Write a protein that binds this DNA or RNA. Structure first.
Ligand SMILES: Nc1ncnc2c1ncn2[C@H]1C[C@H](O)[C@@H](COP(=O)(O)OP(=O)(O)OP(=O)(O)O)O1
Ligand SMILES: [Ca+2]
Ligand SMILES: [Ca+2]
Ligand SMILES: [Ca+2]
Ligand SMILES: [Ca+2]
Ligand SMILES: [Ca+2]
Length: 903
DNA sequence: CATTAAGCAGTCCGCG
DNA sequence: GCGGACTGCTTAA
């Protein structure tokens, strides 16, 4: 097999590399790497090395990495560019692996771990590590085993061995319900003292050294706790055995009233699953406890136990260990679904970077571009200092706030990457400039054609049409990958709906799910077999379809994120290829494209409808247009349609057969106008929206820019079994909105869009009547808590103190002196509740860590003093008032002359 | 070592 | 009791 790296580090003049050899064996080597850098040289000097602008360079081979670094400094002092890859480990990987890396994940040791630490005096701080580590569960991906290290004797209590037999039993039978499928994979190791536990764990670690180290919150808790605990007991050099190169770096962060740290373990790639989830999941959660996320991702219930965690080991050691194990497993379950470790490996090896560098789009792209240029013997430019400078982005149309009955939307494929490719935007493809006209002059096709020779953006930039650019070349590769995966995702989505339709008529039989690949649209023969399946088999197939969709989503959305990341990197001062000419060439072109096509669509629809000057495009944001289809439906007459699906089919056909060709013609004209390299402005129909035929539903509404709701029947070619609400920007979509309020507002919208005003009024009446009965957590608002210290004046709110920070301060005073109340952590999220006048907390609100029950001591007082009136008005009524006024509806029956009668 | 546009909640201040 | 300037937070893209 071809060799591939596992980890790489620079330590002084040495590169330390862990890798898999040609026999599939894990190896380590230390290399005194001899890096090269480059300097511009005279034309008369024959060379094979050229910078990206074709200027000749001479190669400077250094005896060591420090010499190369020192030379960079001297060149800066002289005032001359020092070219080439200055991150030497990237150059080393590029030199060592001068081919496309084919890696074998089965050879890569992925470790998932979590530790338990009993602490009778508040949160056990990793930087202090003053309490015994009393449990470790460490899952090894190569062994496929959960290694459980259990401390039986501690200053905080002596306990009996954990029982695997009780652990397997149902919770309803006194057990812990450790999943049956991992019972046989547990290797249990009890210890009589902590020193022996930790010594054995370190020995184990040497035998099975993680390459990828993950788990929930490992970077901020488990890793620094284990490191510091071992340091305190055995000394720092023993602790450094956690690094296969025995080198660590301690990063101390000061927070005025916190002081925590992160430990870099050289030779290990730490990918904290919380960080992976935050980067790759495209959610924004009100809480990041493993309980909350596991519930969200897997629909599994919270791991329940009685009493505080500080007392769980002593009272119920059995459950304590079981919950440690299950916690480790739940991360594995989330990854089985989301596949973020797979993604990280794919991306890391594609770029030839340290795997943990997938968190940095700048590092990732720098490496991809360096490798691409190196293949052509080209030399990359030196990174330079740039002052931060704001620049213009996308265009967003101001919508007329209103209900909108029939809507069809259209969207440009992968806009910013497509602009890059169409225009040919790259650092080395810049051909010059032209004199800009006002943007509206381009939009309206009245400005002089910018160039008949070069490819242009309305920001004034010109690019070569007959040269390949490294940015377009490499962005195209990732786009094409993205496209493949999105295809699989959409196919799985369509397949899911086929199964959902068949679930309306399940067969009474004993059968099995069909062996199919959900990444491809089901054949007619598969569809025939599906219509004969049992509910059990259909539901299993739907689970598999949805899981395929999720896998596809992870793969496509994050490749989309990477390529969009390149467009944005051009506007980040730390990017080697920072250039606002290129960054704004993209965004300005996008503004033109959107407004150009708005014009073209208005012109076209007026033409086919026999009218003039009517506004069909009601809204647009960045690369999308929303077209009012009322006149289209009216042109034929609503009476002509047999059911909802009939008009949906009609509009689908209309968009594909009539509008899309007109849109394509419009964009081809724009491409000729800008004299672009390749036409890539592909705008396809996205949503078809409207009320159910015959209903009093309003179909859709806009309240303003980035704020709308649509009742959707078909999305990007997926014909839904049941209409789906597309709500953007409204409070239902915000993690700050109380959970039950999101729910109630969504039903309010559903009723508006599908059923009408009277249905809405009936629901509002009910929710207002029952509001006071909802669980307090379900009606609490949520906020991130930043700069708490800034507004903290002796436990009281300083000037301009934000509402949620005021709540936190109220909480801190309420829990003062109590050494077992959960402290609010800077930067993390809190639940927030308003408090009635004259409450014992002495302020208008309280806040506490999100995803948690408020501590028992003050829970009673919170519940008693909760301001339900304020809460309802602010979180529910006020947003709903916004939706209904825009939609020209009332959520409450208004008074009228009819009130004089008895109905 | 490392994208912009834009809406809403809230504080402060002004307001016989 | 609101509106304008301003900060903070969180979306859409
Ligand atoms: N998360 C983001 N970060 C940076 N730029 C973004 C982001 N989302 C969107 N943009 C910019 C770049 C996109 O090309 C443009 C249009 O957004 P959008 O339509 O969501 O995706 P897209 O056009 O890139 O892909 P798709 O093919 O899925 O439509 O807005
Ligand atoms: Ca725990
Ligand atoms: Ca798009
Ligand atoms: Ca059937
Ligand atoms: Ca879009
Ligand atoms: Ca599309």
């Amino acid at each position: 097999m071809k060799e591939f790296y596992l980890t790489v580090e620079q330590i002084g003049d040495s590169i330390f590399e862990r890798y898999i050899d040609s026999n599939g064996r894990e190896r380590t080597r230390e290399v005194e790497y001899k890096p090269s850098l480059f300097a511009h040289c005279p034309e008369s000097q024959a060379t094979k090395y050229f910078d990206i602008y074709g200027k000749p360079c001479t190669r400077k081979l250094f005896a060591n990495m420090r010499d190369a670094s020192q030379w960079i400094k001297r060149m800066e002092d002289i005032g001359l560019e020092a070219l080439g890859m200055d991150d030497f480990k990237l150059a080393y990987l590029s030199d060592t692996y001068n081919y496309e890396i084919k890696y074998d994940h089965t050879k890569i040791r992925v470790a998932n771990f979590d530790i338990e630490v009993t602490s009778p005096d508040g949160f056990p701080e990793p930087s202090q590590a003053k309490h015994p580590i009393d449990a470790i569960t460490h899952y090894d991906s190569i062994d496929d085993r959960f290694y459980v290290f259990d401390l039986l004797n501690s200053p905080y209590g002596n306990v009996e061995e954990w029982s695997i037999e009780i652990a397997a039993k149902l919770q309803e039978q006194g057990g812990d319900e450790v999943p049956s499928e991992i019972i046989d994979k547990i290797i249990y190791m009890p210890f009589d003292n902590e020193k022996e536990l930790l010594m054995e764990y370190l020995n184990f670690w040497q035998q099975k050294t993680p390459v990828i180290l993950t788990g929930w919150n490992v970077e901020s808790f488990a890793i620094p706790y284990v490191y510091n605990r071992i340091k305190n007991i055995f000394g720092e050099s023993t602790a450094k055995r956690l690094s296969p190169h025995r080198k660590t770096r301690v990063k101390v962060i000061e927070n005025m009233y916190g002081s925590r740290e992160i430990i870099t373990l050289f030779g290990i790639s730490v990918l904290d699953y919380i960080d992976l989830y935050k980067k790759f999941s495209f959610t924004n959660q009100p809480s990041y406890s493993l309980d909350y996320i596991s519930e969200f991702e897997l629909n599994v219930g919270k791991l329940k136990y009685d009493g505080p965690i500080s007392k769980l080991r002593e009272s119920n050691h059995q459950r304590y260990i079981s919950y440690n194990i299950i916690a480790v497993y739940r991360v594995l379950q989330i990854d089985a679904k989301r596949q973020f470790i797979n993604l990280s490996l794919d991306m890391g090896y594609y770029a030839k970077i340290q795997i943990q560098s997938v968190f940095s789009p700048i590092k990732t792209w720098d490496a991809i571009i360096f490798n691409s240029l190196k293949e052509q013997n080209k030399v990359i430019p030196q990174g330079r200092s740039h002052p931060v400078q704001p620049y213009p982005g996308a265009f967003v149309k101001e919508p007329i706030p209103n209900r909108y009955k029939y809507v069809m939307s259209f969207d440009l494929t992968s806009l910013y990457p497509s602009i890059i490719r169409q225009v040919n935007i790259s650092p080395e493809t810049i051909a010059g400039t032209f004199k800009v006209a006002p943007l509206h002059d381009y939009i309206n096709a009245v400005a002089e054609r910018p160039s008949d020779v070069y490819s242009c953006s309305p920001n004034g930039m010109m690019y070569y049409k007959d040269r390949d650019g490294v940015v377009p070349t490499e962005i195209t590769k990732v786009f094409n990958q993205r496209k493949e995966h999105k295809g699989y995702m959409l196919a799985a989505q369509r397949n899911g709906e086929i199964i959902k339709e068949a679930l309306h008529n399940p067969n009474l039989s004993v059968d099995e799910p069909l062996d199919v690949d959900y990444r491809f649209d089901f054949s007619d023969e598969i569809k025939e077999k599906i219509k004969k399946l049992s509910a059990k088999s259909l539901n299993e197939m739907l689970f598999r379809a949805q899981r395929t969709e999720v896998a596809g989503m992870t793969a496509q959305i994050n490749r989309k994120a990477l390529i969009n990341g390149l467009a944005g990197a051009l506007g980040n001062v730390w990017f080697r290829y920072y250039d606002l000419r290129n960054a704004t060439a993209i965004t300005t072109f996008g503004q033109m494209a959107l407004q150009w096509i708005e014009r073209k669509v208005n012109e076209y629809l007026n033409e086919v409808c026999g009218t003039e000057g009517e506004a069909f495009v009601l809204y647009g944001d960045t690369d999308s247009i929303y077209v009012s289809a009322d006149k289209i439906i009216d042109k034929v007459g609503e009476s002509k349609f047999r059911d909802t699906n009939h008009w949906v089919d009609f509009l689908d056909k209309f968009a594909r057969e009539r509008m899309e060709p007109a849109i394509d013609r419009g964009f081809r004209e724009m491409c000729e106008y800008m004299n672009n390299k390749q036409h890539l402005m592909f705008m396809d129909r996205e949503a078809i929206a409207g009320p159910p035929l015959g209903s009093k539903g309003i179909g859709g509404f806009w309240t303003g820019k980035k704020r709308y709701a649509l009742n959707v029947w078909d999305m990007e070619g997926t014909r839904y079994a049941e209409p789906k609400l597309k709500i953007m920007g409204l409070e239902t979509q915000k993690s700050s909105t109380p959970k039950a309020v999101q729910k109630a507002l969504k039903e309010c919208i559903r009723r508006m869009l599908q059923e009408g005003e009277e249905s809405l009024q009936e629901y509002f009446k009910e929710f207002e009547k029952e509001f006071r009965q909802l669980n307090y957590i379900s009606i609490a608002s949520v906020s991130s808590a930043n700069n708490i210290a800034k507004y903290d004046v002796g436990g009281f709110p300083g000037p301009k103190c934000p509402f949620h920070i005021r709540g936190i301060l109220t909480y801190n005073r309420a829990i003062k002196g109590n050494i077992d109340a959960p402290q609010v952590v800077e930067g993390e999220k809190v639940y927030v509740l308003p408090l009635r006048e004259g409450n014992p907390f002495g302020d208008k609100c309280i806040a506490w860590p999100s995803g948690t029950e408020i501590t028992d001591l003050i829970k009673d007082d919170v519940l008693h003093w909760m301001d339900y009136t304020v809460l309802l008005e602010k979180t529910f009524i006020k947003p709903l008032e916004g939706f209904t006024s825009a939609a020209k509806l009332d959520y409450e029956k208004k008074a009228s002359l009819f009130d004089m009668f008895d109905f």
